[PDB]
Design a protein around this ligand. Sequence first.
Ligand SMILES: [Cl-]
Ligand code: NI
Ligand SMILES: [Zn+2]
Ligand SMILES: [Zn+2]
Lengths: 128, 127
Amino acid sequence: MRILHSMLRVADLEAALEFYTRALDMRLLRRRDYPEGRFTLAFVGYQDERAAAALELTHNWDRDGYTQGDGYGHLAIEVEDAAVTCARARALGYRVTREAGLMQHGRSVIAFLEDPDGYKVELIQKGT
Amino acid sequence: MRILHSMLRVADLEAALEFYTRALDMRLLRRRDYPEGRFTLAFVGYQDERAAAALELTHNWDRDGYTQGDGYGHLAIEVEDAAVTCARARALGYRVTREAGLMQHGRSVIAFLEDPDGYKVELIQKG
Ligand SMILES: [Cl-]
Ligand code: NI
Ligand SMILES: [Zn+2]
Ligand SMILES: [Zn+2]
């Protein structure tokens, strides 16, 4: 057994893809657009779906938006340097909700970004 | 770069761990109380955290529950036999829903498990 993917609903697939590919260096693994069902799916990530868990982005062509709650937490990504990823995210005009630094009572360098839909992305610096 | 985990907040950590380990055969990889923050973290999965992305469970001590939005979808898991995992989750009292005609899954009927907090788990038969 293995974890395949986490699925999130997005209001604007192109805006979501611009975030994951540019700010996070993910590549588009697979995309399927279904005119019959009026929805699109896009799997983004770092490794092939066969090798690792990916991020599934779902776009309902007729849904303008989604309501966020407090149940879903975040997607965490391992980065070489968290300050660098934050500065790159800011240069692209993406939201850094928590700048890189050691978290509360730990030696872990962490940072938080928000994707265009408001989903939290946790950056954890390699060495933690 | 790599995906480390997906995080879900749970109202009852023990109920949640009972579901992930018994219904889904996940291993409890790591678990830690954070008394200053008044929360506990649990990491469940099938492989070592250094080798694969896991599922992070957050239990806030002073909370009874969460308000689920409609954006969050599901967590998909690869299984050896979806019918067996389904029949096992049912025996334990967990809800199983099945969907036919999902154009993204061809001719496959896909089963979805419902966890104690109402989060959906997509079952994908290996192959
Ligand atoms: Cl749209
Ligand atoms: Ni996390
Ligand atoms: Zn899925
Ligand atoms: Zn699916």
